[PDB]
Design a protein around this ligand. Structure first.
Ligand SMILES: O=P(O)(O)OC[C@@H](O)[C@@H](O)c1cnc[nH]1
Ligand SMILES: O=P(O)(O)OC[C@@H](O)[C@@H](O)c1cnc[nH]1
Ligand SMILES: O=P(O)(O)OC[C@@H](O)[C@@H](O)c1cnc[nH]1
Ligand SMILES: O=P(O)(O)OC[C@@H](O)[C@@H](O)c1cnc[nH]1
Ligand SMILES: O=P(O)(O)OC[C@@H](O)[C@@H](O)c1cnc[nH]1
Ligand SMILES: O=P(O)(O)OC[C@@H](O)[C@@H](O)c1cnc[nH]1
Ligand SMILES: [Cl-]
Ligand SMILES: [Cl-]
Ligand SMILES: [Mn+2]
Ligand SMILES: [Mn+2]
Ligand SMILES: [Mn+2]
Ligand SMILES: [Mn+2]
Ligand SMILES: [Mn+2]
Ligand SMILES: [Mn+2]
Ligand SMILES: [Mn+2]
Ligand SMILES: [Mn+2]
Ligand SMILES: [Mn+2]
Ligand SMILES: [Mn+2]
Ligand SMILES: [Mn+2]
Ligand SMILES: [Mn+2]
Lengths: 191, 191, 191, 191, 191, 191
């Protein structure tokens, strides 16, 4: 019904997305960038999408190409799955408290790509979230949101009202986008 | 059921409003001020009202009297259509992204007129939106919201979080008020 | 009794004023500048003058010449109608609230032309009030008051205490001048 | 002739107002908030109203609900007693010196509710006037003036030019409103 | 179904709370601190809880101990009534306009106690709301929200966007928390 | 009816005042300080008093003692002539434009001496108005107003809104006090 499968093969990466807007949060993400997997699993779950993401890319360089190519492909899938956008709420927004952090996202499924990202503390422009695998540079958060909005052809406004921990700040933003999309894609019982 | 017809005849203008709160966005606006027609059509549609507005006024002077008299009459209609306000959500709010602009409105159908308008950039106090007909001076936006709130006897808080284009800033505010009213006037399944 | 008819024919304009200081607000103004007509109708009415103004001028250029020539002729009429100024209150002042705006005017019918205009927000030096006809540039308000005072040979002090809307700010000033003149021209039962 | 009796029963308070605009200052106020009684007795007397106010409310909470409900009911009475407002002065203003304090009020009985309150020193936002009974928090002064203006449907501008004592500052404002109303409601021998 | 009865007996106070999350706003509060009773009645009603609160404490000292012990016990009741939190919306937020004041609350029923309180004007750190009984010091508002969040084990973010009257600022915050909880505790038809 | 004759003999001066509050501006002033004579003639005339002032003092020293003793005696006369103050307007105020200068005075005939003087430009604290006789130091203006208020037992607030010429600034203040007294001492047809 509201499903899309997108395959995107570049010099740098190979991506497969399966998206259902009308899911129950059945989510499986494997990009080779485990913090990014965690963020897209939060996005898929909190959006009540069913979402499969399989990505392999040039992580010897760093995560950037894989992260960007995945967000492009996911945006393309969102736009294709929304189709004509008849009968939906269209507007959605969500506040996400995560301990000390408060984030917000507002969306308009307008067919007019726009992204505005504000309030992220300056330390996230050079922060690395590093474990035993490929690390995640938080400067990429803005890039993920612009790539999603640009390829879904939606207006996406993401705000950090305040926060300190880069993991809390990043995860609250992904969750806020997720819950804002959930509200916007839902059938509107009056239109 | 939740309907009002208001006729308001002054030295300056003659207004007829037909409002149904429980509509599907059947909207027809003719004020002689075409940008204002566009804004009240957005307000009527995004509120899921059925709304007819016919206004003729002294536009040789400028739009102000017609715009104000229309907003007074529309506020009066909203207040009459709400009646005793039994069983409604009462509170409503909506964020409207419009490209670079983000606006917000929050309402309390409290029977206590109040309007607070903040964040509109200073250039909108002397901006004109001009086409082939009677122009619209954006300084009037505040006046429209105060006139609506004062005559509906509601609390209306309109915020521009940020924005640049005066058309985007104005339309996002009208749409935000519209979606905030829609949520507030809806039956509350628990009261 | 306290009446004057002034005819003023220049290269730019042709003006006829009929003024009675002891009127009941019977006012008819036609200058070809409809916002100016509105302001002089407010001035004539709020002053309890009987006032007829017929002006035709070079509005292809803009309203300035017609507005100035009218204010000169009206000032001349006021001064002629006051004559020897025996037995009048001489001093008058009035506060005019107009929604968010508060204006004040104080007059001394002293035979010593002086005008002081203060507190008008800076945006009124480049604001246009535009309808379907010849527009009104609010920068002219100061010019109207100086032309009135200079030709009536009176002291006129006009103050904007605060305000935002250029129509409210302009109309409150004309009304304040009107009510200040009304008080000053009235017979003083003790002199 | 220009009389109104208003009864207003809420969960929080029970109010009866009897107002005559054409009185001689026959005033009796009992709200359970003795400083408020003093202020409305000054307002009734200085306005040359005949005014009876009987209010009982939830003063166990604090004076706010009773003070607000009384000001709403009094505003409603003022608006009803003014009726069509034919033949009145319409505009009124008064300066009240009270020792070190100077206050001013200006009114327009315009049918367009507006209140602007300026110049009150910042200490009155957290001052308590306390005796042997229910105290009066001076932060409520603004609320009283907005409630009066909103329900009488008038423009009310209240200014503190300067002052120090919170009792002098509050009483000078009530007296200024009182004398401004007195002038505005009076028959205008020329309209 | 989602009910809790909490009894909390300390040296300073004796508290009984009966809470039903799935109520219709049947609320009865008696703490001996009547402004606090008013705030918890607003919280219970606006949350559509059924809520009984009976508290007696050492109000000879001041309200603080009773207010804190009540908020602890109420938080404990909320956490117990939520149980495993299966199938709920989890996130909730609400804007409350109250005349000049705008407040907001956002909650995450995360099992991770956190409270952030921002934007309350500095005068509320030393304001007293006083009637004929035990007064309420507004500095305690922060303490109530931290005690609720800490014992319910939830994330609670309370914001004052702007406001002046301490009663409006306090009541808008309690109402915002109330409506945010209502949304968060509701069954989520998709999880 | 409302008359007083005051004789005041000090080491420094000998003063006789004859004052009628209900005069037609029959004024004769001789103090030996001709600019002061001019100011009290303006005060007497503009107040519609009948006023005779004869003063001789130690002008070899300077005008100060004579000016002060005269203002004391005049204040005493005003207070005695007002008597019980039954049936008067009590409050009065007047704006006086004098070319570039605007002054204001507000009075309350309260029996509570108070004077507040503000806005006089700093150059008037060391300006001399000098002719062919005894000069007048404008620093004395404040002293005259305090001496009048203190001995009449009235509240007198004198303001210079703006001005440049010390003669215009001084004369506008005396005239403003004069017209404010005139309004305040007049019978109030409603009390
Ligand atoms: O709220 P969720 O259960 O979707 O997230 C789990 C949470 O424990 C984890 O993502 C986290 C907690 N702090 C940082 N990250
Ligand atoms: O979002 P709507 O379809 O209600 O609005 C139409 C839109 O294309 C137009 O109003 C607009 C776009 N930019 C400025 N104005
Ligand atoms: O107060 P008056 O009735 O003279 O003015 C009419 C009024 O409705 C109109 O001039 C106006 C209202 N807001 C801007 N202009
Ligand atoms: O001016 P009135 O007589 O209406 O007010 C009496 C006055 O003595 C009292 O209200 C007061 C004096 N200082 C503070 N309050
Ligand atoms: O909105 P509610 O009816 O729950 O609140 C009643 C309201 O009248 C009262 O709480 C109030 C109004 N201003 C301050 N307090
Ligand atoms: O306004 P009066 O006529 O009372 O004042 C006469 C005036 O010509 C004289 O006092 C003056 C003019 N400029 C300074 N002083
Ligand atoms: Cl002033
Ligand atoms: Cl926000
Ligand atoms: Mn890139
Ligand atoms: Mn995590
Ligand atoms: Mn207007
Ligand atoms: Mn548009
Ligand atoms: Mn010119
Ligand atoms: Mn107008
Ligand atoms: Mn209130
Ligand atoms: Mn007092
Ligand atoms: Mn504590
Ligand atoms: Mn309350
Ligand atoms: Mn001295
Ligand atoms: Mn002079």
């Amino acid at each position: 019904s509201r499903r899309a499968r997108i395959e995107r093969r570049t010099r740098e990466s190979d991506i497969v997305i399966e998206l259902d807007l009308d899911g129950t949060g059945q989510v499986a993400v494997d990009t080779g960038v485990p913090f990014y997997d965690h963020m897209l699993t939060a996005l898929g779950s909190h959006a009540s999408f069913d979402l499969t993401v399989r990505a392999t890319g040039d992580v010897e360089i760093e995560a950037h190409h894989t992260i960007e190519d995945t967000a492009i492909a996911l945006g393309t899938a969102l736009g294709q799955a929304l189709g004509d956008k008849r009968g939906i709420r269209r507007f959605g927004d969500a506040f996400i408290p995560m301990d000390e952090t408060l984030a917000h996202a507002a969306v308009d499924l307008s067919g007019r790509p726009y992204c505005v990202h504000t309030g992220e503390p300056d330390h996230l422009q050079h922060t690395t979230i590093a474990g035993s695998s490929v690390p995640y540079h938080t400067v990429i958060n803005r890039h993920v949101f612009e790539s999603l909005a640009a390829n879904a052809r939606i207006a996406l406004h993401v705000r950090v009202l305040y926060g300190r921990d880069p993991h809390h700040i990043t995860e609250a933003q992904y969750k806020a986008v997720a819950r804002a999309l959930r509200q916007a894609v839902e059938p509107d019982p009056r239109v």
